[PDB]
Design goal:
Two copies of one chain form a homodimer.
Chain A: E1 4-13, E2 18-27, E3 33-42, E4 46-53, E5 58-65, H1 67-70, E6 78-81, E7 83-86, H2 92-103, E8 110-117, E9 126-133, E10 144-149, H3 150-159, H4 165-177
The complex binds chloride ion (CL) (2 copies) and magnesium ion (3 copies).
PDB class: hydrolase
Keywords: nudix, GDP_mannose, hydrolase, biofilm
Assembly: dimeric
């Protein structure tokens, strides 16, 4: 796999985000040279934050219409997710504190977990994952604020009611962390 | 409540399809127009292989040009075995992908969930599986087929877990599987 030589980068779409067709030569371990041609969709990077309450034993999530989901088996298009946004010229922590105010709370301490490529087959997207405590100290649209029992959130992963990658990632992390114990 | 598709413009269509979708969303009050790009690459399946005797997992590593252009210096990415459904049912797809990529003929598998991975503008839903493997189930060396160039990694499960902390594993579905396995006590 070793040797990579970029050959061409053709822009297929420059509408708003960018779709590329990238051609590169890849030398396999047997020494054979294969030319790959691969579509790469660049819609930028993102941050997401699970909000939790240790005293109430609750999490706060958001529900909104996701058109990409609506065209692919999600009947209503509505999706339950952790608060998230695009890193829009902002550092991850700056982006996410701002998204926490807008979507849901002006949180205090956040904890960063990891930064993960969510769909590396054909999408550049890297997501910065955070958790943070919320209270009624730190306090009507298409974006519905959901406050639910953590035990309920876990159950909705089992039934399929919560079926978003980053959200399940975050809820599983909280489960194992002991912050809700 | 109500969603109405207004226009679906095809921005690109070679194998996969990029859309620009205009739709009208109705609120509680009762209409707002939105326009969003939607990238349709199809759905896929992924599997984490584990060995309770050896306490090992099997993962793969291959060049991902999409990570290369965005922070991943070498472009090499450690992931769980995965592929696109390409009109097979998820379990059919995944046993096929597992023997091609890892060399293992898997026995019984466990379905975990099916998750949208990047729902901001990608349709992709991934079917998640795990399966126990045995050394006597290795039929070949794996490595993929056609133009695939895949390195097969068998490693201590405790080692793959700490690679999540060090960033040596930085793939969403793979961390999801590894964390699911840890919570399961199957490797205890
Ligand atoms: Cl209506
Ligand atoms: Cl089990
Ligand atoms: Mg958002
Ligand atoms: Mg694959
Ligand atoms: Mg494959």
């Amino acid at each position: 796999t070793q040797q990579i030589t970029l050959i061409k980068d053709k822009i297929l779409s420059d509408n708003y985000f960018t779709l590329h067709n990238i051609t590169y030569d890849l030398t396999r371990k047997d020494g054979e040279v294969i030319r790959h041609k691969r579509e790469v969709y660049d819609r930028g990077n993102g941050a997401t934050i699970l909000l939790y309450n240790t005293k109430k034993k609750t999490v706060v999530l958001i529900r909104q219409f996701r058109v990409a989901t609506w065209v692919n088996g999600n009947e209503s298009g509505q999706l339950i997710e952790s608060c998230a946004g695009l890193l829009d010229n902002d550092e991850p922590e700056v982006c996410i504190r701002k998204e926490a105010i807008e979507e849901t709370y002006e949180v205090g301490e956040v904890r960063k977990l990891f930064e993960l490529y969510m769909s590396p087959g054909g999408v550049t997207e890297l997501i910065h994952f955070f958790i943070a405590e919320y209270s009624d100290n730190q306090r009507d649209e298409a974006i519905e604020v959901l406050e639910l029992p953590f035990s309920q959130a876990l159950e909705m992963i089992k039934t399929g009611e919560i079926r978003d990658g980053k959200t399940v990632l975050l809820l599983n992390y909280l489960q194992t962390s002991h912050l809700m114990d």
